[PDB]
Amino acid sequence: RVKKVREMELIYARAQLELEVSKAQQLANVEAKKFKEMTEALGPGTIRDLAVAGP
Amino acid sequence: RVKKVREMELIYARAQLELEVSKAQQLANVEAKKFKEMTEALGPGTIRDLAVAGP
Numbered sequence: 001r002v003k004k005v006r007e008m009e010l011i012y013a014r015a016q017l018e019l020e021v022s023k024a025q026q027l028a029n030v031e032a033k034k035f036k037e038m039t040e041a042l043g044p045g046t047i048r049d050l051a052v053a054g055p
Numbered sequence: 056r057v058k059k060v061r062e063m064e065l066i067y068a069r070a071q072l073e074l075e076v077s078k079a080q081q082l083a084n085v086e087a088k089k090f091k092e093m094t095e096a097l098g099p100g101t102i103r104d105l106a107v108a109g110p
Contacts, residue, residue, distance in 0.1 A: 023072050023076065026076040034083035043102070050102070053109060
């Protein structure tokens, strides 16, 4: 009983702890994608000058 | 019972946790699109001078 309850929970938790990583994987892509679509569209050099303004 | 309830919930939650990412994916596009339609329409050089104003 204690074997087939923790062992069967393990294979269940295995396909869920890895399902958890696929969520974070796809959400990391759309974050980096939408980051890329702004950083280059804004300006590779503009980001540099916009931060260094100190006069 | 505990197999076919958590396993069937897994395939259900799988097609929902990935449905969640498609929402964030399309919303990231319209954000970056509408960002692109303003940043270039405003001025690639204008964004640089508008921030560096310090006199």
